[PDB]
Amino acid sequence: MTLAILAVFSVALTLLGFVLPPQGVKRATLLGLALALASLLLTWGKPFAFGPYAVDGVSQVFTLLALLGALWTVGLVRSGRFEFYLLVLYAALGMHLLASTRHLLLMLVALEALSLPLYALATWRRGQGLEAALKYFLLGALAAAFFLYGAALFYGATGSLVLGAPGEGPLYALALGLLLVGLGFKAALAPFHFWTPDVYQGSPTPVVLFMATSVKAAAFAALLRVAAPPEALALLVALSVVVGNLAALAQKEAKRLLAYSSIAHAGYMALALYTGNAQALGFYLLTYVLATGLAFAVLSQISPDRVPLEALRGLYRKDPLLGLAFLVAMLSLLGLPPLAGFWGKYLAFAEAARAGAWGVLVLALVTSAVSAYYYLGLGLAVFARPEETPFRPGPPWARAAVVAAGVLLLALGLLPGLVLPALAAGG
Amino acid sequence: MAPIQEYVGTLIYVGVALFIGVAALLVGALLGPKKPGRAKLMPYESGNDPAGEVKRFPVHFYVVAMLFILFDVEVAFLWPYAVSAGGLGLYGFLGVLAFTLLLFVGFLYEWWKGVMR
Amino acid sequence: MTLNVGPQHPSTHGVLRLMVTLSGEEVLEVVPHIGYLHTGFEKTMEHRTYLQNITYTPRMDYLHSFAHDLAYALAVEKLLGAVVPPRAETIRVILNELSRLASHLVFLGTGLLDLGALTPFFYAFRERETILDLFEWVTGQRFHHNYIRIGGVKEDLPEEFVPELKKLLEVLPHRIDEYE
Amino acid sequence: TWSYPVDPYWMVALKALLVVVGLLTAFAFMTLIERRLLARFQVRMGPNRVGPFGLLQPLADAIKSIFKEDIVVAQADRFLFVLAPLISVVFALLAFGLIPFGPPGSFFGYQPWVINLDLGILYLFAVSELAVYGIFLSGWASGSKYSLLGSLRSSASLISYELGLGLALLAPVLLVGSLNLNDIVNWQKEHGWLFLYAFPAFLVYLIASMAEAARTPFDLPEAEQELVGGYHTEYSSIKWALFQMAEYIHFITASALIPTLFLGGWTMPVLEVPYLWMFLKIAFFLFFFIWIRATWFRLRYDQLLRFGWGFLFPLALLWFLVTALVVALDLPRTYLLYLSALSFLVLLGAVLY
Amino acid sequence: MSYLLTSALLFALGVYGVLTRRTAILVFLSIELMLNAANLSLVGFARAYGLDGQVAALMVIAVAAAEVAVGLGLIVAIFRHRESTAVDDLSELRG
Amino acid sequence: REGILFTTLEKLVAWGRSNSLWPATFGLACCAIEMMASTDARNDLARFGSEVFRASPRQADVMIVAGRLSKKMAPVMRRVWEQMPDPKWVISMGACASSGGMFNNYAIVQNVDSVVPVDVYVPGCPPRPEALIYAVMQLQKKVRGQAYNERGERLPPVAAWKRTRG
Amino acid sequence: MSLLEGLALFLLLLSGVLVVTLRNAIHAALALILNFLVLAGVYVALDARFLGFIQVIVYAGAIVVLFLFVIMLLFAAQGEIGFDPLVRSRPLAALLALGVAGILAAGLWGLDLAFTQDLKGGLPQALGPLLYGDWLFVLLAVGFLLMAATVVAVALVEPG
Ligand code: SF4
């Protein structure tokens, strides 16, 4: 009964924007997201399904993360176009529907419904924004066509469009591949990774925050329902992580480097799919969402258009707490103790080893060790000598959000046996 | 329902209509003076420029067509409820009413924003 | 869209060319272009007798001509001092207002037809036909009538003119009230 | 076609060819009658010439139509130039066989109709959309952007009101429950004259047909006196003839459909004659429509868009939802009669303020 | 079964279009062709597996209409002031 | 095929073209008002076949030059003649158009036959509406091969059929 | 069957080849409309009757109508401007188009299915209870998707 809250707020605001100032609309959107988050929590351990809409721990956790990302990215959006808020609402609802069903066709409708408002939110009208939106839309519709033929061949291998069917030989494998194409594209897995750097570089920074958190979250929420074979999973992980880290080595701009890093991180998250633990992946994505939203909130405080790596430098002297949280985020994404990224990474690797894929895991670990080069070149750059750089030291809004993100990251890294007990049915 | 023979009869209808249309066009084309001239083949309005060199046409017609495709999808969804109505009862009526209200919210949004633009 | 509304097309009465600077459905600005009817009354009148020019005066405004006839006659009278009989002045105002009725009929007919309905053109124009016949009684011509003179009017009215005028004057009030 | 037989394919082809040449003769003589009726409206009288009743003047017109140098204009698409009139005519002729001109077997043995598809209104809807297709395509192919803009106005308006046609047609489907015209006509046989139940939607159907070039937008446009129209202005001998032919067939198709759907398709309570009542109702609607042609002004396509989009279509869907509640709950069939009579009294009393 | 093979071939043709085309709109057309091939496969497997693929293809039509509307808005916004719709004309974002 | 090459077919199509005369006015001056008056409810050229009035030149066979033809308009009107379907006819209405009339000056074409091939001339100022009907009936019998000059010669059905346009 | 079935399939594939091959955008869209007509006939042949009629109404009648409206507002018919041709990608592209079918052909090869079901015609009479009901949730999701799509396009053009 959370989706009803989302729908009510969205539909009412669609008209209320004519009588309410965009700021009042922003307050309304924020209230709706907080109410939906609270309704999700009060239903913790209360799975609820009416039709093909089915809420389990996965729906609960991933929609909680998506709602967090939406709240954070709405805090920064201050444009006087109430539409620039409405779309955000949609995506949340859309992503909710993505994690809340097993029906492949409702999965497609949910994907389109959460993705379309992103295409429009990416228009600050900066000439790069147009190029980004065009690549995004074209490649996304291509992936949607592939995913739809996959759902069709699924219906061919089984009488229902719901996942879990027994499955045939070549036809079921082929349908699985045609679904995996779109799902990995949405999750920014290579060799479907091309769109992510360009789109993250072109889009306004807070929108990139929202994307790199909630879109990847919901994409893996949908992947968890699929029974992806180990060969496909291994190929995706290998190619994704390798290209992610390597192409990130060559990056000169923070947002493009972070997009390649997120490709590598989707490659890592693709390990928990070996078992579909939904506990390992839930934990990993919790930590990743917090850290990446933090990093992109800081980057938005720097510049929405584009931020080079040098702009990050001197940040500690500029703002100490900000530099500290940025260091925490770089290390947590590096998955280093005593930070929660280590626990998420370990849980994914434990799922992988339990599935019995060893060489893939070793290659992932080597690529993660290579990643430390730029992870430190970003985290440690905070202390460097400040060069010429625009700096907007946020409102107390973004400061408090960043502080809470870093605090939750370290708290759950130090004592993970606090929430990890309740990632199953929810005791 | 209806037998499939009616659809082959429909194909025959199309065949006769198309045949007669092509026959009429042949009558028109073959019976004529056929003295082509340079200015005769020129589009219109005395040398050049009926409209001439103009910027791309208003997007208003794009919006007209997009509105139309969306609302025709609406109607295509409303018809299956129109045929089976008494059987779907208040449940189907309520579902169709909520659906209609969603797309009517879309209409009211585009109207209070308007497209004179 | 610098649109070239050509002369006479699309159906732009009174041959005239228009350059409609136009974006969308509005009208940014219309640049008119005229001269397609330049005949040269002001030049040809320099080479025609005063009496002959009364044949050139109605042809400029061919709808309300008797105002041109009157203007030219009055100007030449004031120039050489002619004495207008009173009945000539009465008849001149009669013919002036009558040709004004015919001009106004044509203006509103063309306007309604140009955009709107085609029907109301006929009825008004029908009454115009009636008016035209009156001139044929006295001038022998529909319009371009050479009836005015320097002193007054050319010759006296027939017996049959006035009763037809009364017929039309009694049918007209209901008619104009119907258009209104 | 649950209870109705199927004629042989050769008989279907025979009836089709007959319907098409009859539509030809009908639109020629209806051009005559419209000329004379508009004439009578404006007290001038029509062509008492080449006839006497004029009934040999369309022959002279057709004789002009061919031999008139069917011209291929330069700067025009070689193929679409010739193809678009064919599209407009093909997709205009058909969708008229479905109209029942009598009870089964009343074609002197086989079938009053040509095809009686299970889904009729959808076929009508699709072939009505393809007419707008031909309109704006010919506008484009002409190579004249002046005429292109008129083609765009035409297409926009026709498309908007063509959308409204769906919500107009929704209401009676609830009552009859079938998408074949014969079931609907038989329902008007039993309960009687569906417009009594659904007069408001009938209205938004009627006015919708005005937007399909019938009249009073009248900024369709025709090339005359406004931003010139599309789909003509570059075709001379036979293609122009095909454009006018298809437009008039569409006019008469609407004039025939309006009584078939809401009012009494022939099926009279009295004298139950197959063809004569339907043709006479066609004549009534045609005369009222020519009255409109003569008697009313233009709309300028902006107020036309406003009236169609903001007024007609929401009203049609409101009535559809009302009828849907009533039918699914099936409480009486009387409630719709009462509500339509009351609504007509409302939309009537507001006139003479 | 020839229907399903033809749907696969139409998907392949749409792939060839998306890859070969230079214009954005023609790529979008090839994608629509891919969608219709998918719909044909769905109708065949509904004939096989009990009629659900028909409602499936209906919802697919509606999804297609949504994405067509939004994508054409995009195509408008990006190439309104700009020159030729050629998709290679925008190479600002490089690796 | 030009309405020719069969003894019956050419008389038939001459009948058809004659009663199917579609007048396309090119309203220039006070002649044009007396042509518009030939459409009202006293004297309508709406019987012989001339009811419909297509402003487009691609659609009409009779071109009626009704008014003075000033030189600045001479090519424009000219092109409307070139942009007409080939079975086309041209009438010169009034004195200013037929000859230079009384405006025998620098501005006015002294015979519209200069720019367009004229079929029939109709004097008058303005030519009475019934006279314009007379000229269209004259043209009717001219395209029937029923028209002779003062010198005994029969006049061909279509003027503008004998000219090397350029 | 096979008599006209071969015809329909040959026309379908030929139209696809046109829509992907022709450089006339208008002619490509027209070949896709012809494809849609052939495909609606195929749909009806497959006992889906309502779906073929909507395929003509919405897809051909509405979608590619807006496509044509866009390419007529923005001429774009001669697409080959601003080339960057990458000529060698033209054969290579087809290669991938081959594979994307072949593996599908492999997954569908040697695949025989029970094509025996009395659909009773794909009429909406039976689809009503299926749509409003088992699909009502997917229906309402679709409706919200379209409403949001309208809002997205409005805010996307929105010159201000
Ligand atoms: S001939 Fe007489 S009526 Fe005709 S344009 Fe000349 S002045 Fe006017």
Rounded to the nearest 5°, which phi and psi values hold at F64? -105, 105
Q: Find the helix packing angle between D9-41 and D57-65, rounded to 10°.
A: 110
As for how many domains chain A has, the answer is 1
Cα–Cα distance between F22 and F45 in angstroms, integer? Answer: 10
User: Resolution limit in angstroms?
Assistant: 3.2
Taking CA F148 as the corner, what is the angle to CA F142 and CA F149, rounded to the nearest 5 degrees?
120
Name the CA dihedral angle for D205, D207, D213, D216, rounded to a multiple of 10 degrees: 180
Cβ within 8 Å of residue G53, ≥6 positions away: D119, D122, D123, D126, G40
Do strands F62-66 and F23-27 pair parallel, antiparallel, or not at all (unpaired)? parallel
D126 touches chain G (CB under 8 A): yes
For A8, half-sphere exposure in the C-beta direction (CA atoms, 13 angstrom radius) is 10
Distance set, CA C97 to CA A56, A239, C90, C104, C167 (Å)? 92, 95, 11, 10, 16
- F64 membership: H or E segment, kind and range: strand F62-66
Residue nearest to atom 4 of ligand 1 (CA): F31
F132 CB near ligand 1 (under 6 Å): no
Left, alpha or beta for C109 (phi > 0: left; psi -120 to 50: alpha)? alpha
Q: What share of chain D is helix, strand, coil (3-state, %, to 5)?
A: 65, 0, 35
The label of the residue with tokens 């320097």 reads C150
DSSP-based three-state secondary structure for G84: coil
Method: X-ray
CB A134 within 8 A of CB E24: yes
Cα–Cα distance between A340 and A333 in angstroms, integer? Answer: 9
The rounded Å distance from CA B107 to ligand 1 centre is 58
The label of the residue with tokens 């000033």 reads F70
Cα–Cα distance between E32 and E23 in angstroms, integer? Answer: 15
CB spacing of G117 vs E33 below 8 angstroms = no
Return the number of other C-beta atoms located less than 10 Å from residue A184's C-beta.
Answer: 25
Structural domain span for residue A11:
1-427
Q: How far is the alpha carbon of D230 from chain F, nearest alpha carbon, in Å?
A: 12
Cα–Cα distance between A113 and A96 in angstroms, integer? Answer: 10
Distance set, CA G104 to CA A150, A179, D274, G127 (Å)? 10, 13, 57, 30
Cα–Cα distance between A139 and E19 in angstroms, integer? Answer: 11
Write b or e for each residue in A194-204: b if 16 or more Cβ atoms lie within 10 A of its Cβ, otherwise e. bbbbbbbbbbb
DSSP-based three-state secondary structure for G80: coil
Spatial strand order of the sheet with C2-5 comes to: C2-5, C17-21, C29-33
CB spacing of G142 vs A109 below 8 angstroms = yes
Amino acid at C85: P
CB A65 within 8 A of CB A221: no
E51 touches chain B (CB under 8 A): no
DSSP-based three-state secondary structure for A251: coil
Q: How far is the alpha carbon of A80 from chain B, nearest alpha carbon, in Å?
A: 15
**Tokens representing residue D173 in the block:** 């489907």
Structural domain span for residue B81:
4-113
CB D286 within 8 A of CB D255: yes
CB spacing of F87 vs B46 below 8 angstroms = no
Say whether the D–B interface has 3 or more Cβ pairs within 8 Å. yes
- CATH of residue B106's domain is 1.20.58.1610
Amino acid at D183: D
**Tokens representing residue D248 in the block:** 């008039």
Q: What is the CA radius of gyration of chain A?
A: 20
The label of the residue with tokens 């015209």 reads D181
The rounded Å distance from CA F97 to ligand 1 centre is 8
- A342 membership: H or E segment, kind and range: helix A340-355
Rounded to the nearest 5°, which phi and psi values hold at F65? -80, 95
Spatial strand order of the sheet with F89-93 comes to: F23-27, F62-66, F89-93, F120-122
Cα–Cα distance between A157 and G21 in angstroms, integer? Answer: 33
Q: Which residues pair with E23 in a beta bridge?
A: E86
CB A296 within 8 A of CB A205: yes
> Measured between alpha carbons, how far apart are the two ends of chain A, in Å?
21
Cα–Cα distance between B74 and G143 in angstroms, integer? Answer: 8
For a ligand 1 pocket test, name from F25, F26, F28, F30 the mutation site with the most ligand atoms within 8 angstroms of its C-beta. Answer: F30
Cβ within 8 Å of residue D50, ≥6 positions away: D56, D57, D60, F19, F48, F49
Write b or e for each residue in C94-116: b if 16 or more Cβ atoms lie within 10 A of its Cβ, otherwise e. bbbebbebbbebbeebbebbeee
Write b or e for each residue in B23-39: b if 16 or more Cβ atoms lie within 10 A of its Cβ, otherwise e. ebbebbbebbbeeeeeb
As for how many domains chain B has, the answer is 1
For a ligand 1 pocket test, name from C65, C144, C145, C146 the mutation site with the most ligand atoms within 8 angstroms of its C-beta. Answer: C144
Write b or e for each residue in F136-150: b if 16 or more Cβ atoms lie within 10 A of its Cβ, otherwise e. bebbbebbeeebeee
Cα–Cα distance between D303 and G133 in angstroms, integer? Answer: 40
CB G32 within 8 A of CB D133: no
Cβ within 8 Å of residue G4, ≥6 positions away: none
Q: Which residues pair with C31 in a beta bridge?
A: C19
Longest dimension (CA), chain B: 70
The rounded Å distance from CA F159 to ligand 1 centre is 24
Cα–Cα distance between C45 and G72 in angstroms, integer? Answer: 55
**Tokens representing residue A218 in the block:** 């919901």
Ligand 1 atom nearest to F124, measured from its CA: 1
Do strands F62-66 and F120-122 pair parallel, antiparallel, or not at all (unpaired)? unpaired
- Nearest residue in B to A8, CA atom: B102
Got the DSSP string for A358-393? -HHHHHHHHHHHHHHHHHHHHHGGGGS---S-----
Say whether the G–F interface has 3 or more Cβ pairs within 8 Å. no
HEC assignment per residue over A152-214: HHHHHHCCCCECCCCCCCHHHHHHHHHHHHHHHHHCCCCCCCCHHHHHHHHCCHHHHHHHHHH
Cα–Cα distance between A397 and A402 in angstroms, integer? Answer: 9
Residue nearest to atom 7 of ligand 1 (CA): C59
**Which of these, A412, D302, D320, G1, lies nearest to C27 by C-alpha position?**
D302
For a ligand 1 pocket test, name from F25, F26, F28, F31 the mutation site with the most ligand atoms within 8 angstroms of its C-beta. Answer: F31
**Which of these, D299, D317, E64, lies nearest to G66 by C-alpha position?**
E64
In this complex, the residue of D9, D20, D233 whose CB is nearest that of residue B9 is D9
DSSP state of A307: -
CB C122 within 8 A of CB F40: yes
CB G73 within 8 A of CB B58: yes
In this complex, the residue of C2, C7, C9 whose CB is nearest that of residue B52 is C2
The rounded Å distance from CA A385 to ligand 1 centre is 92
Domain F1-160, CATH number (from 3.90.226.10, 3.40.50.12280, 1.10.357.10, 1.20.140.10): 3.40.50.12280
Cα–Cα distance between D110 and F91 in angstroms, integer? Answer: 56
Residue nearest to atom 8 of ligand 1 (CA): F30
